[PDB]
Amino acid sequence: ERSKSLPFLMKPKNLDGSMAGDVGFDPLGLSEINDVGVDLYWLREAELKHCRLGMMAAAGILFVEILGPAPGFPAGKSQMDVFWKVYAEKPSLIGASLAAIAILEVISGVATTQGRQNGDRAPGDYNFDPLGFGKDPAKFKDLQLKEVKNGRLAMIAAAGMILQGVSTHQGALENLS
Amino acid sequence: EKSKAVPFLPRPAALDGSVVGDVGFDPVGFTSWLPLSYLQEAEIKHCRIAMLATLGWIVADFVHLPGAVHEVSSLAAHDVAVKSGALAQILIWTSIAEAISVIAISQMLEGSGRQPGDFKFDPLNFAKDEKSLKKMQLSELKNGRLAMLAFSGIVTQAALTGHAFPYM
Ligand code: CLA
Ligand SMILES: C/C(C=C=C1C(C)(C)C[C@H](O)C[C@@]1(C)O)=C/C=C/C(C)=C/C=C/C=C(C)/C=C/C=C(/C=C/[C@@]12O[C@]1(C)C[C@@H](O)CC2(C)C)CO
Ligand SMILES: CC(/C=C/C=C(C)/C=C/[C@@]12O[C@]1(C)C[C@@H](O)CC2(C)C)=C\C=C\C=C(C)\C=C\C=C(C)\C=C\[C@@]12O[C@]1(C)C[C@@H](O)CC2(C)C
């Protein structure tokens, strides 16, 4: 009856055990929202998209700062400020990436709403397993848990890197030391 | 359910299997409120127009017709051809063809039996049975889509950088 994460709180009604990373940590009861097209399905899809985006962004920042930029690309070690140097010399790359992300996000929203309507697609599912790393069950649950935990950690990390780069105008590991 | 192209999206519910080049790609559901034959005709018309346009752009940046008016790049050829009246002739004959097309598409939508884009233009055969016709329709659709995207890229790159045939 009590949430596993917060023993002083009752179990959130909509979070039983199903989703990976579920420990009952919903103090504000946001999982019970059923308005403005927002429900547990939409919240989970948003969480998974945030997890994946944060993982990609943190990996990119760390890669560029440690191993350096790719040939022909600007340096500076400040990832929040090197973006304007890339846009100053290769605006077409940024524009094409933005257009591609826009199209993919329109497709993602359509897929989310459709799967919410005629329930056949789990939240965050895009059938993207080209290498077959999660075919069999009893490993899919473990992979989902790993992805969720890594994505939450990378969300926090990427938000921290964004704020550090905006404020200190220095590199992430530069702030570290 | 679970359209072939986008495996996580539902089938567009208007494209089951009985159209050439039908991989179930309609995420925004254009076929849900527009006739399928109308959209097919529009797509095939775009394919043919853009194939001709890509070939003409690339060729005219290499070979020029005799005369001083034809000595401009394809990027600047529009303002020269419109002034000389060269594009007026193309406009006149294209308008005639498109009025006949108005009649044809109206008849196709109101029964008839004319397949979308089927003008029966076939001096040579190149398509003897149903299988050959289907294969060549798929080839035409794929080549037309590729040429539409290719002309888009060619024009955008040439406008961005006023370069010759290599528009990099
Ligand atoms: C979308 C189709 C299209 C359009 C609008 C244009 C437009 C133009 N072309 Mg052009 N061209 C095209 C296709 C096209 N071309 C193709 C496919 C080729 C390859 C043979 C060429 C080869 C070409 C050359 C070599 C030159 C032009 C030039 C020009 C410019 C002025 C003279 C002229 O009209 O061309 C004259 C066109 C030709 C001599 C060949 C056209 C052959 C046609 C397109 C193929 C048969 C299709 C058939 C007749 C369709 C019937 C239509 C129906 C309604 C009845 C003008 C901007 C001239 C210029 O100023 O260059 C900058 C020039 O020197 N074009
Ligand atoms: C209606 C809709 C879409 C939809 C739909 C459909 C289509 C109807 C389908 C469904 O049926 C429903 C629904 C709702 O899904 C809404 C669209 C979404 C919006 C409104 C898009 C918002 C995106 C904004 C982002 C993601 C911007 C991020 C900015 C960053 C800046 C980066 C910086 O580097 C910059 C530039 C400068 C640097 O110095 C430092 C920083 C600041 C870090 C980080 O990235
Ligand atoms: C949109 C795009 C790029 C957009 C870039 C933009 C907006 C950038 C704009 C800017 O930089 C400028 C210009 C100047 C700056 O000052 C301002 C900004 C704004 C910064 C590229 C698309 C590029 C699109 C591309 C490359 C498409 C390739 C498509 C292929 C290969 C298709 C293949 C098929 O069609 C066939 C062949 C057969 C079919 O049946 C099957 C498939 C597979 C679908």
Q: Are B74 and B158 in contact (CB under 8 A)?
A: yes
Q: How far apart are CA A62 and CA B41, in angstroms?
A: 51
Residue type, A159: A
Reference B163, options B50, B53, B57, B49; nearest CA is B57
Ligand 2 atom closest to the Cα of residue A83 is: 34
- Closest-CA residue, ligand 3 atom 41, reads B142
Q: Is the CB of B162 under 6 A from ligand 1?
A: no
For residue A51, count other CB atoms closer than 10 A to its CB. Answer: 21
Residue whose CA is at the smallest distance from ligand 2 atom 20: A102
Element (H, E) at B152: helix B130-160
- The token duo for A123 is 């939240």
- Ligand 3 in reach of A75 Cβ (< 6 A): no
| Sign of the alpha-carbon dihedral angle for B66, B71, B73, B76 | negative
Q: How far apart are CA B145 and CA B56, in angstroms?
A: 16
Say if residues B119 and B103 touch (Cβ distance below 8 Å): no
DSSP B19: S
The token pair that represents B64 in the structure block: 């020029």
In this complex, do A118 and B10 lie within 8 Å of one another by their Cβ atoms? yes
- Is A110's CB within 8 Å of B27's CB? yes
Return the number of other C-beta atoms located less than 10 Å from residue A6's C-beta: 15
Rounded-to-integer distance, Cα A46 and Cα B142, Å: 36
Query: Which residue do the tokens 């008016």 mark?
Result: B69
CB B47 within 8 A of CB B33: no
Query: Experimental method for this entry?
Result: cryo-EM
DSSP letter (8 states) at residue B125: -
DSSP-based three-state secondary structure for B136? helix
Interface probe, candidates A104, A117, A127, A128, chain B, greatest B C-beta count within 10 A? A127
Question: CA A40 to CA A111: how far, in whole Å?
Answer: 16
Find the B160 Cα to ligand 3 centroid distance in Å: 14
3-state secondary structure chain A: CECCCCCCCECCCCCCCCCCCCCCCCCCCHHHCCECCECHHHHHHHHHHHHHHHHHHHHHHHHHHHHCCCCCCCCCCCHHHHHHHHHHHCHHHHHHHHHHHHHHHHHHHHHHHHHHHCCCCCCCCCCCCCCCCCCCCCCHHHHHHHHHHHHHHHHHHHHHHHHHHHHHCCCHHHHHC
How far is Cα A167 from Cα A174, in angstroms, rounded to an integer?
A: 13
The Å distance, Cα A143 to ligand 2 centre, comes to 28
Radius of gyration, CA atoms only, chain A: 19
Say if the Cβ atoms of B9 and A110 lie within 8 Å: yes
Residue B32 DSSP symbol: G
How many beta-carbon contacts under 8 Å exist across A and B? 25
Query: How far apart are alpha carbons B111 and B102 in whole angstroms?
Result: 14
* CB-CB neighbours of A150 under 10 Å: 16
How distant, in Å, are the alpha carbons of B54, B129, B132 from that of B136? 20, 11, 6
CB B41 within 8 A of CB B105: yes
Q: What is the 3-state secondary structure (H, E, C) of B49-107?
A: HHHHHHHHHHHHCCCCCCCCCCCCCCCCHHHHHHHHCHHHHHHHHHHHHHHHHHHHHHH
Half-sphere exposure of B111 (CA within 13 A, CB side): 1
Which residues from A are below 8 Å from B28, CB to CB? 106, 110
